């Protein structure tokens with residue numbers, strides 16, 4: 001529920017892979033007791049911490065007592081409205097129960113160009129899984145990277161599984177706003193293998209050969225992009 005990583009020794013190691021500089025404005029998701037928040041303010045330009053728990057916001061403010069370049073807002077990340085004309089990045093050690101909602105919220109309803117998250121090892125593995133609809137919807141907006149492993153012992157209470165530190169970098173969308181609908185439809189039908197609803201036996205054939213897809217259990221996002229494009233061509 002509310003896991004905390006409080007060992008300075010361990011926080012420094014995790015910060016080692018987090019390349020954020022003095023000039024970046026940061027929005028942290030779930031500052032908790034403020035352990036990461038304190039390293040962020042000393043590292044970055046400004047830190048807007050968003051914590052839904054009113055008590056924790058206090059603890060966080062207390063921890064940053066000696067700093068002035070932050071702000072702790074007691075709100076729900078899911079409801080929060082990120083800036084629209086600003087360069088900012090995001091960091092967060094987030095709750096597993098809402099990982100999906102949080103990651104969609106910050107990728108699709110945020111314009112942060114760089115996003116650093118600590119999530120469960122398996123959850124992370126599926127974000128890079130081109131057989132899953134979530135991965136496909138995200139890869140059109142960001143590049144995903146697993147930077148390292150965060151041992152469960154680093155957490156408390158000690159969770160059953162290990163977690164991973166992932167990075168998400170925004171890029172020029174691979175899908176035009178015009179194809180919003182189509183892509184969404186195509187994505188769903190493809191992850192469900194309802195091929196018939198999106199391709200004729202031949203279109204499907206040619207599309208795979210054209211895409212270079214030899215094995216349906218191992219397609220790159222690039223190859224999938226190709227499928228969606230052949231799909232568009234075959235239908236107006």
Ligand SMILES: C[S@@+](CC[C@H](N)C(=O)[O-])C[C@H]1O[C@@H](n2cnc3c(N)ncnc32)[C@H](O)[C@@H]1O
Nearest residue numbers: 003004005030031032051052053076077093095
């Ligand atoms: C795994 S903990 C991370 C705690 C802190 N970052 C740390 O590592 O010590 C998740 C944190 O996010 C907060 N949280 C959970 N759901 C939230 C939401 N919808 N909006 C904002 N914060 C939320 C929890 O209260 C908690 O502080």
